[PDB]
Design a protein around this ligand. Structure first.
Ligand code: HHG
Ligand code: HHG
Lengths: 118, 118
C-alpha cells in the first residue's frame, strides 16, 4: 500500500510513467533518477529537475516535437512544481503536479520502478 | 554532414531517437548520456549501457511492457552491441546495432540532440 513519503526517498533507477492532465489527456513516458537529478521524456517533450529539499522542486519541461499535442496544450516550454511529499511504495508512487503559477493546470502521475542504474 | 567519430564523443544530454529493425518495425524513444553512462527507453522497453573504449559497448535492453510488441520480437531481455564508431555531427548521429550473438537481428538508429543536462 502507498504511504506519504518524501519524493527524495525514491530508489535510483529507471521508471515507467503514466499521466493525465486537467484537460483529460493522457501520456506515457520514461523517468530517470540519479542522485537528486531527474531526467525523462516522452514522444513530444523531455524533462529535467533536481530533487529540492529546501526549495520547491521545479521540473523543467521542454517540448521537442510540436507535431504532437501536449497533454496540457501549452504550446511552449513550461515548469511543473513537484510536491515534496508523495504516496509511494518501494516500486510505486503517484503525485499531482501543477504548472508553476497556475494550479488549475496539472497532471496526475503514476510512476512504476523498472530497474536500477548500472 | 555526418562523419565517422567515436560514439564516446557524443555531447552529454538528452537525445530523441528513432529506429527500425531487420523485421522492418519502427520505434521511437528517449536516450540520455551522462559520463559514459547511457540510459533510455520507450513505451515498451528501457536500456542502459556504459560507453566502453577498451571493451565492446553492451547495451542492456529490458522489456517492461509485454502488452506492446518489440521492434525485434524477442519477447525477453537481450543485449545490443553498440559500435565503437558512428556517423555524426554535433547534434546528430546514426548507428547500426545488432543483437549480441546474432548479427541478423539488428536496428538502425538515428539520434537527435535535444538539450544538455542541468
Ligand atoms: C518526478 C515526477 C515526474 C513529473 C511528471 C512529469 O514530468 O510529466 C511530464 C508531463 O506530463 C509532460 O507533459 P507534456 O508532454 O504535455 O508537456
Ligand atoms: C547508444 C545508441 C542507442 C542504442 C539503440 C537502442 O537502444 O534502441 C532501442 C531498441 O530498439 C529497443 O528495442 P525493443 O523495444 O524492440 O526491445
Amino acid at each position: 500500500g502507498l504511504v506519504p513519503r518524501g519524493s527524495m526517498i525514491m530508489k535510483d533507477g529507471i521508471y515507467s510513467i503514466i499521466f493525465i492532465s486537467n484537460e483529460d489527456s493522457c501520456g506515457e513516458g520514461i523517468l530517470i533518477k540519479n542522485g537528486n537529478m531527474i531526467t525523462g521524456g516522452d514522444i513530444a517533450s523531455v524533462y529535467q529537475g533536481v530533487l529540492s529539499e529546501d526549495e520547491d522542486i521545479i521540473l523543467h519541461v521542454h517540448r521537442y516535437n510540436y507535431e504532437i499535442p501536449s497533454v496540457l496544450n501549452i504550446e511552449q516550454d513550461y515548469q511543473l512544481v513537484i510536491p515534496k511529499k508523495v504516496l509511494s511504495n518501494d516500486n510505486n508512487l503517484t503525485l499531482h503536479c501543477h504548472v508553476r503559477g497556475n494550479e488549475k493546470l496539472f497532471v496526475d502521475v503514476y510512476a512504476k520502478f523498472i530497474e536500477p542504474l548500472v
